[PDB]
Enzyme design. Sequence first.
Site, PDB file in Angstrom:
ATOM      1  N   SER A   1      66.872  30.425 -27.958  1.00  0.00           N
ATOM      2  CA  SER A   1      68.166  30.603 -27.316  1.00  0.00           C
ATOM      3  C   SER A   1      68.161  31.862 -26.465  1.00  0.00           C
ATOM      4  CB  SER A   1      69.283  30.684 -28.362  1.00  0.00           C
ATOM      5  OG  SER A   1      69.073  29.738 -29.394  1.00  0.00           O
TER       6      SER A   1
ATOM      7  N   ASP B   1      54.768  24.138 -17.556  1.00  0.00           N
ATOM      8  CA  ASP B   1      56.054  23.452 -17.587  1.00  0.00           C
ATOM      9  C   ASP B   1      56.807  23.711 -16.285  1.00  0.00           C
ATOM     10  OD1 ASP B   1      58.091  21.841 -18.504  1.00  0.00           O
ATOM     11  OD2 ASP B   1      58.966  23.357 -19.835  1.00  0.00           O
TER      12      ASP B   1
ATOM     13  N   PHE C   1      63.440  25.269 -28.990  1.00  0.00           N
ATOM     14  CA  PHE C   1      62.505  26.373 -28.800  1.00  0.00           C
ATOM     15  C   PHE C   1      63.143  27.711 -29.163  1.00  0.00           C
ATOM     16  CE2 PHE C   1      64.346  28.397 -25.136  1.00  0.00           C
ATOM     17  CZ  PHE C   1      65.161  27.409 -24.620  1.00  0.00           C
TER      18      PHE C   1
ATOM     19  N   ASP D   1      69.880  27.715 -11.366  1.00  0.00           N
ATOM     20  CA  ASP D   1      68.573  27.094 -11.495  1.00  0.00           C
ATOM     21  C   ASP D   1      68.469  25.880 -10.569  1.00  0.00           C
ATOM     22  OD1 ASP D   1      68.860  25.082 -14.582  1.00  0.00           O
ATOM     23  OD2 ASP D   1      69.854  24.927 -12.638  1.00  0.00           O
TER      24      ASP D   1
HETATM   25  C1  LIG Z   1      63.488  28.327 -22.192  1.00  0.00           C
HETATM   26  N1  LIG Z   1      63.782  29.568 -21.478  1.00  0.00           N
HETATM   27  N2  LIG Z   1      63.136  30.792 -21.647  1.00  0.00           N
HETATM   28  C2  LIG Z   1      63.670  31.662 -20.834  1.00  0.00           C
HETATM   29  C3  LIG Z   1      64.665  31.019 -20.093  1.00  0.00           C
HETATM   30  N3  LIG Z   1      65.537  31.573 -19.137  1.00  0.00           N
HETATM   31  C4  LIG Z   1      65.405  32.793 -18.576  1.00  0.00           C
HETATM   32  O1  LIG Z   1      64.473  33.539 -18.822  1.00  0.00           O
HETATM   33  C5  LIG Z   1      66.488  33.197 -17.681  1.00  0.00           C
HETATM   34  N4  LIG Z   1      67.474  32.349 -17.382  1.00  0.00           N
HETATM   35  C6  LIG Z   1      68.416  32.776 -16.602  1.00  0.00           C
HETATM   36  C7  LIG Z   1      69.575  31.970 -16.146  1.00  0.00           C
HETATM   37  C8  LIG Z   1      69.578  30.575 -16.245  1.00  0.00           C
HETATM   38  F1  LIG Z   1      68.517  29.926 -16.755  1.00  0.00           F
HETATM   39  C9  LIG Z   1      70.678  29.846 -15.824  1.00  0.00           C
HETATM   40  C10 LIG Z   1      71.784  30.486 -15.295  1.00  0.00           C
HETATM   41  C11 LIG Z   1      71.788  31.864 -15.189  1.00  0.00           C
HETATM   42  C12 LIG Z   1      70.696  32.600 -15.608  1.00  0.00           C
HETATM   43  F2  LIG Z   1      70.724  33.942 -15.496  1.00  0.00           F
HETATM   44  S1  LIG Z   1      68.119  34.468 -16.204  1.00  0.00           S
HETATM   45  C13 LIG Z   1      66.644  34.463 -17.159  1.00  0.00           C
HETATM   46  N5  LIG Z   1      65.789  35.536 -17.323  1.00  0.00           N
HETATM   47  C14 LIG Z   1      64.735  29.734 -20.524  1.00  0.00           C
HETATM   48  N6  LIG Z   1      65.614  28.772 -20.013  1.00  0.00           N
HETATM   49  C15 LIG Z   1      66.721  28.422 -20.915  1.00  0.00           C
HETATM   50  C16 LIG Z   1      67.998  28.602 -20.237  1.00  0.00           C
HETATM   51  C17 LIG Z   1      68.322  27.418 -19.294  1.00  0.00           C
HETATM   52  C18 LIG Z   1      67.163  27.206 -18.348  1.00  0.00           C
HETATM   53  N7  LIG Z   1      67.607  26.323 -17.255  1.00  0.00           N
HETATM   54  C19 LIG Z   1      65.932  26.558 -19.009  1.00  0.00           C
HETATM   55  C20 LIG Z   1      64.937  27.604 -19.517  1.00  0.00           C
END
Ligand SMILES: Cn1ncc(NC(=O)c2nc(-c3c(F)cccc3F)sc2N)c1N1CCC[C@H](N)CC1
EC number: 2.7.11.1
Length: 273
Positions: A19, A135, A17, A96
Amino acid sequence: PLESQYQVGPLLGSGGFGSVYSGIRVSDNLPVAIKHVEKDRISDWGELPNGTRVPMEVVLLKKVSSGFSGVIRLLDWFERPDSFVLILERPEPVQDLFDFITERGALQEELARSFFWQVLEAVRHCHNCGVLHRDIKDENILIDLNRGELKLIDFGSGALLKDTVYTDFDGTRVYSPPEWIRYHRYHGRSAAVWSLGILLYDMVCGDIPFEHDEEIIRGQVFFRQRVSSECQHLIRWCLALRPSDRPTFEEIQNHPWMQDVLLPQETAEIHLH
Ligand SMILES: Cn1ncc(NC(=O)c2nc(-c3c(F)cccc3F)sc2N)c1N1CCC[C@H](N)CC1
Protein backbone atom coordinates in the site's frame (compact mmCIF):
# COMPACT_ATOMS: atom_id res chain seq x y z
CA PRO A 1 11.19 7.81 13.46
CA LEU A 2 9.35 8.28 10.15
CA GLU A 3 6.00 8.90 11.87
CA SER A 4 7.31 12.41 12.64
CA GLN A 5 9.57 13.20 9.67
CA TYR A 6 6.60 12.85 7.30
CA GLN A 7 2.90 13.66 7.41
CA VAL A 8 0.86 10.75 6.06
CA GLY A 9 -1.85 11.66 3.58
CA PRO A 10 -4.56 9.67 1.81
CA LEU A 11 -4.23 6.37 -0.03
CA LEU A 12 -3.06 6.62 -3.66
CA GLY A 13 -3.33 2.97 -4.70
CA SER A 14 -3.50 -0.44 -3.05
CA GLY A 15 -3.05 -4.13 -3.80
CA GLY A 16 -1.97 -7.40 -2.25
CA PHE A 17 1.65 -6.41 -2.88
CA GLY A 18 1.38 -3.49 -0.46
CA SER A 19 0.00 0.00 0.00
CA VAL A 20 1.28 3.45 -0.97
CA TYR A 21 0.03 6.69 0.61
CA SER A 22 0.46 10.35 -0.24
CA GLY A 23 2.84 12.22 2.02
CA ILE A 24 4.63 15.47 2.76
CA ARG A 25 8.15 15.75 4.16
CA VAL A 26 7.63 17.82 7.30
CA SER A 27 11.05 19.47 7.05
CA ASP A 28 10.76 21.17 3.65
CA ASN A 29 7.14 20.32 2.70
CA LEU A 30 8.49 18.17 -0.14
CA PRO A 31 5.63 16.07 -1.58
CA VAL A 32 6.45 12.36 -1.25
CA ALA A 33 4.84 8.93 -1.45
CA ILE A 34 4.98 6.42 1.40
CA LYS A 35 4.94 2.74 0.41
CA HIS A 36 4.43 -0.07 2.93
CA VAL A 37 5.20 -3.71 2.17
CA GLU A 38 4.87 -6.51 4.72
CA LYS A 39 7.84 -8.83 5.15
CA ASP A 40 5.52 -11.85 4.84
CA ARG A 41 4.55 -10.87 1.29
CA ILE A 42 8.19 -10.37 0.23
CA SER A 43 9.35 -13.10 -2.16
CA ASP A 44 12.39 -11.31 -3.66
CA TRP A 45 15.13 -10.47 -1.17
CA GLY A 46 18.41 -8.75 -1.96
CA GLU A 47 21.69 -7.57 -0.48
CA LEU A 48 22.68 -3.95 0.09
CA PRO A 49 26.23 -2.74 -0.66
CA ASN A 50 26.77 -2.77 3.12
CA GLY A 51 25.51 -6.36 3.41
CA THR A 52 21.95 -5.91 4.69
CA ARG A 53 18.96 -8.18 4.12
CA VAL A 54 16.55 -5.89 2.29
CA PRO A 55 13.74 -6.27 -0.29
CA MET A 56 14.98 -6.53 -3.87
CA GLU A 57 12.78 -3.51 -4.67
CA VAL A 58 15.04 -1.39 -2.45
CA VAL A 59 18.18 -2.70 -4.16
CA LEU A 60 16.75 -1.86 -7.58
CA LEU A 61 15.51 1.59 -6.52
CA LYS A 62 18.92 2.47 -5.05
CA LYS A 63 20.67 1.55 -8.31
CA VAL A 64 18.46 3.79 -10.48
CA SER A 65 17.71 6.73 -8.15
CA SER A 66 20.62 9.04 -9.14
CA GLY A 67 20.25 12.09 -11.36
CA PHE A 68 17.80 10.98 -14.04
CA SER A 69 14.15 11.96 -13.57
CA GLY A 70 12.77 9.25 -15.87
CA VAL A 71 12.08 6.95 -12.91
CA ILE A 72 10.60 7.82 -9.52
CA ARG A 73 13.47 8.06 -7.06
CA LEU A 74 13.82 6.38 -3.66
CA LEU A 75 14.31 9.20 -1.16
CA ASP A 76 14.76 7.02 1.95
CA TRP A 77 13.57 3.81 3.58
CA PHE A 78 13.01 2.26 7.00
CA GLU A 79 12.63 -1.23 8.46
CA ARG A 80 9.76 -1.92 10.86
CA PRO A 81 9.13 -5.10 12.87
CA ASP A 82 6.83 -6.64 10.24
CA SER A 83 7.29 -4.37 7.21
CA PHE A 84 9.52 -2.01 5.26
CA VAL A 85 8.60 1.60 4.46
CA LEU A 86 9.76 3.37 1.29
CA ILE A 87 9.76 7.16 0.91
CA LEU A 88 9.33 7.95 -2.78
CA GLU A 89 9.31 11.08 -4.93
CA ARG A 90 5.90 12.48 -5.87
CA PRO A 91 5.27 15.00 -8.66
CA GLU A 92 2.47 17.54 -8.37
CA PRO A 93 0.19 17.67 -10.22
CA VAL A 94 0.44 14.03 -11.36
CA GLN A 95 -1.68 11.36 -13.02
CA ASP A 96 -0.84 7.84 -14.16
CA LEU A 97 -1.03 6.79 -17.80
CA PHE A 98 -3.95 4.40 -17.28
CA ASP A 99 -6.21 7.10 -15.86
CA PHE A 100 -4.98 9.48 -18.57
CA ILE A 101 -5.86 7.04 -21.39
CA THR A 102 -9.19 6.24 -19.73
CA GLU A 103 -9.96 9.95 -19.43
CA ARG A 104 -8.90 11.11 -22.91
CA GLY A 105 -9.29 7.94 -24.98
CA ALA A 106 -6.67 6.81 -27.46
CA LEU A 107 -3.87 9.36 -27.65
CA GLN A 108 -2.92 11.30 -30.76
CA GLU A 109 0.22 9.92 -32.34
CA GLU A 110 2.25 13.09 -31.71
CA LEU A 111 1.46 12.75 -27.99
CA ALA A 112 1.97 8.97 -28.01
CA ARG A 113 5.34 9.51 -29.71
CA SER A 114 6.55 11.80 -26.92
CA PHE A 115 5.28 9.53 -24.13
CA PHE A 116 6.62 6.29 -25.64
CA TRP A 117 9.96 7.98 -26.32
CA GLN A 118 10.22 9.05 -22.68
CA VAL A 119 9.50 5.57 -21.35
CA LEU A 120 12.13 4.17 -23.73
CA GLU A 121 14.62 6.60 -22.19
CA ALA A 122 13.58 5.53 -18.68
CA VAL A 123 13.76 1.79 -19.41
CA ARG A 124 17.08 2.35 -21.18
CA HIS A 125 18.27 4.16 -18.04
CA CYS A 126 17.25 1.18 -15.89
CA HIS A 127 19.12 -1.34 -18.03
CA ASN A 128 22.22 0.91 -17.98
CA CYS A 129 22.02 0.62 -14.18
CA GLY A 130 21.60 -3.17 -14.28
CA VAL A 131 17.88 -3.18 -13.38
CA LEU A 132 14.98 -4.94 -15.12
CA HIS A 133 11.51 -3.51 -14.41
CA ARG A 134 9.43 -6.51 -15.66
CA ASP A 135 6.04 -4.74 -15.28
CA ILE A 136 6.07 -1.94 -17.86
CA LYS A 137 2.50 -0.75 -18.44
CA ASP A 138 0.32 2.34 -18.26
CA GLU A 139 -0.52 1.90 -14.56
CA ASN A 140 3.22 1.99 -13.73
CA ILE A 141 3.86 5.24 -15.69
CA LEU A 142 3.34 8.67 -14.01
CA ILE A 143 2.71 11.91 -15.92
CA ASP A 144 3.95 15.22 -14.53
CA LEU A 145 1.11 17.31 -15.96
CA ASN A 146 3.01 20.62 -15.69
CA ARG A 147 6.36 19.54 -17.16
CA GLY A 148 5.10 16.80 -19.49
CA GLU A 149 7.63 14.31 -18.09
CA LEU A 150 6.90 10.61 -17.55
CA LYS A 151 8.25 8.58 -14.62
CA LEU A 152 8.42 4.84 -13.91
CA ILE A 153 6.95 3.42 -10.66
CA ASP A 154 6.54 -0.04 -8.97
CA PHE A 155 9.84 -2.02 -9.11
CA GLY A 156 8.30 -4.65 -6.80
CA SER A 157 8.40 -7.16 -9.67
CA GLY A 158 11.83 -6.17 -10.99
CA ALA A 159 15.15 -7.99 -10.84
CA LEU A 160 18.82 -7.53 -11.59
CA LEU A 161 19.50 -7.33 -15.32
CA LYS A 162 21.20 -10.47 -16.63
CA ASP A 163 21.91 -11.90 -20.07
CA THR A 164 20.79 -15.47 -19.23
CA VAL A 165 17.22 -16.82 -19.09
CA TYR A 166 14.63 -15.80 -16.52
CA THR A 167 12.49 -18.68 -15.22
CA ASP A 168 10.20 -16.56 -13.02
CA PHE A 169 7.76 -13.75 -13.76
CA ASP A 170 5.39 -11.89 -11.44
CA GLY A 171 4.33 -8.99 -13.66
CA THR A 172 1.09 -8.51 -15.54
CA ARG A 173 0.23 -11.59 -17.59
CA VAL A 174 -1.53 -9.83 -20.48
CA TYR A 175 1.75 -7.89 -20.87
CA SER A 176 3.98 -11.04 -20.85
CA PRO A 177 5.60 -12.34 -24.03
CA PRO A 178 4.56 -15.57 -25.78
CA GLU A 179 7.76 -17.35 -24.72
CA TRP A 180 6.74 -16.92 -21.07
CA ILE A 181 3.24 -18.28 -21.76
CA ARG A 182 4.59 -21.30 -23.65
CA TYR A 183 8.00 -22.13 -22.15
CA HIS A 184 8.17 -20.19 -18.84
CA ARG A 185 11.48 -18.86 -20.22
CA TYR A 186 12.36 -15.38 -21.45
CA HIS A 187 15.23 -12.91 -21.71
CA GLY A 188 14.96 -9.50 -20.09
CA ARG A 189 15.56 -7.10 -22.96
CA SER A 190 13.45 -8.97 -25.51
CA ALA A 191 10.65 -9.45 -22.97
CA ALA A 192 10.75 -5.72 -22.21
CA VAL A 193 10.42 -4.86 -25.90
CA TRP A 194 7.31 -7.06 -26.00
CA SER A 195 5.61 -5.23 -23.14
CA LEU A 196 6.70 -2.02 -24.87
CA GLY A 197 4.71 -2.99 -27.96
CA ILE A 198 1.68 -3.70 -25.79
CA LEU A 199 2.13 -0.28 -24.17
CA LEU A 200 2.32 1.46 -27.56
CA TYR A 201 -0.79 -0.27 -28.89
CA ASP A 202 -2.58 0.66 -25.66
CA MET A 203 -1.51 4.28 -26.15
CA VAL A 204 -2.90 4.71 -29.68
CA CYS A 205 -5.82 2.25 -29.46
CA GLY A 206 -7.03 3.06 -25.94
CA ASP A 207 -6.98 -0.66 -25.02
CA ILE A 208 -4.57 -3.67 -24.76
CA PRO A 209 -4.34 -5.90 -27.91
CA PHE A 210 -4.60 -9.35 -26.25
CA GLU A 211 -6.64 -10.71 -23.33
CA HIS A 212 -6.29 -14.52 -23.43
CA ASP A 213 -3.18 -16.68 -23.65
CA GLU A 214 -4.23 -18.04 -27.05
CA GLU A 215 -4.32 -14.48 -28.39
CA ILE A 216 -0.80 -13.82 -27.06
CA ILE A 217 0.45 -17.09 -28.57
CA ARG A 218 -1.14 -16.26 -31.93
CA GLY A 219 0.30 -12.74 -31.91
CA GLN A 220 -2.09 -11.32 -34.53
CA VAL A 221 -2.64 -7.58 -34.03
CA PHE A 222 -5.95 -6.04 -35.11
CA PHE A 223 -6.34 -2.26 -34.84
CA ARG A 224 -9.61 -0.86 -33.49
CA GLN A 225 -8.58 2.76 -34.22
CA ARG A 226 -7.04 4.71 -37.09
CA VAL A 227 -3.29 4.25 -36.64
CA SER A 228 -0.64 5.34 -39.14
CA SER A 229 1.21 2.74 -41.19
CA GLU A 230 4.50 3.68 -39.50
CA CYS A 231 3.10 3.12 -36.01
CA GLN A 232 1.43 -0.18 -36.94
CA HIS A 233 4.79 -1.42 -38.26
CA LEU A 234 6.65 -0.47 -35.07
CA ILE A 235 3.98 -2.16 -32.94
CA ARG A 236 3.94 -5.37 -34.95
CA TRP A 237 7.76 -5.36 -34.92
CA CYS A 238 7.86 -5.10 -31.11
CA LEU A 239 5.21 -7.83 -30.93
CA ALA A 240 7.15 -10.31 -33.08
CA LEU A 241 6.49 -13.85 -31.84
CA ARG A 242 10.17 -14.78 -32.09
CA PRO A 243 12.16 -12.82 -29.46
CA SER A 244 15.17 -12.55 -31.78
CA ASP A 245 12.87 -10.98 -34.39
CA ARG A 246 12.05 -8.09 -32.07
CA PRO A 247 13.86 -4.76 -32.41
CA THR A 248 16.54 -3.50 -30.07
CA PHE A 249 16.05 -0.24 -28.21
CA GLU A 250 18.32 1.49 -30.73
CA GLU A 251 16.17 0.14 -33.57
CA ILE A 252 12.95 1.34 -31.90
CA GLN A 253 14.29 4.88 -31.45
CA ASN A 254 15.68 4.88 -35.01
CA HIS A 255 12.31 3.75 -36.38
CA PRO A 256 10.69 6.25 -38.78
CA TRP A 257 7.64 6.67 -36.53
CA MET A 258 10.00 7.68 -33.70
CA GLN A 259 11.40 10.78 -35.48
CA ASP A 260 11.08 14.43 -34.48
CA VAL A 261 9.86 13.69 -30.97
CA LEU A 262 8.52 16.68 -29.06
CA LEU A 263 10.36 17.94 -26.01
CA PRO A 264 8.50 17.19 -22.75
CA GLN A 265 7.76 20.89 -22.16
CA GLU A 266 6.52 21.23 -25.75
CA THR A 267 4.40 18.12 -25.18
CA ALA A 268 2.68 19.60 -22.13
CA GLU A 269 2.13 23.01 -23.74
CA ILE A 270 0.38 21.45 -26.75
CA HIS A 271 -1.44 18.49 -25.16
CA LEU A 272 -1.53 18.93 -21.38
CA HIS A 273 -2.02 22.67 -20.67
C1 LIG B 1 2.77 -0.72 -6.72
N1 LIG B 1 3.38 0.60 -6.52
N2 LIG B 1 4.63 0.86 -5.94
C2 LIG B 1 4.83 2.14 -5.95
C3 LIG B 1 3.74 2.76 -6.56
N3 LIG B 1 3.50 4.14 -6.74
C4 LIG B 1 4.41 5.11 -6.57
O1 LIG B 1 5.57 4.89 -6.28
C5 LIG B 1 3.91 6.48 -6.72
N4 LIG B 1 2.65 6.70 -7.09
C6 LIG B 1 2.26 7.94 -7.18
C7 LIG B 1 0.90 8.37 -7.60
C8 LIG B 1 0.03 7.50 -8.26
F1 LIG B 1 0.40 6.24 -8.54
C9 LIG B 1 -1.24 7.93 -8.63
C10 LIG B 1 -1.65 9.22 -8.36
C11 LIG B 1 -0.79 10.09 -7.70
C12 LIG B 1 0.47 9.67 -7.33
F2 LIG B 1 1.29 10.53 -6.69
S1 LIG B 1 3.57 9.00 -6.68
C13 LIG B 1 4.62 7.62 -6.40
N5 LIG B 1 5.93 7.68 -5.98
C14 LIG B 1 2.84 1.79 -6.88
N6 LIG B 1 1.62 2.02 -7.52
C15 LIG B 1 0.44 1.86 -6.64
C16 LIG B 1 -0.37 3.07 -6.68
C17 LIG B 1 -1.26 3.14 -7.94
C18 LIG B 1 -0.39 2.96 -9.17
N7 LIG B 1 -1.16 3.36 -10.35
C19 LIG B 1 0.11 1.52 -9.38
C20 LIG B 1 1.48 1.28 -8.74
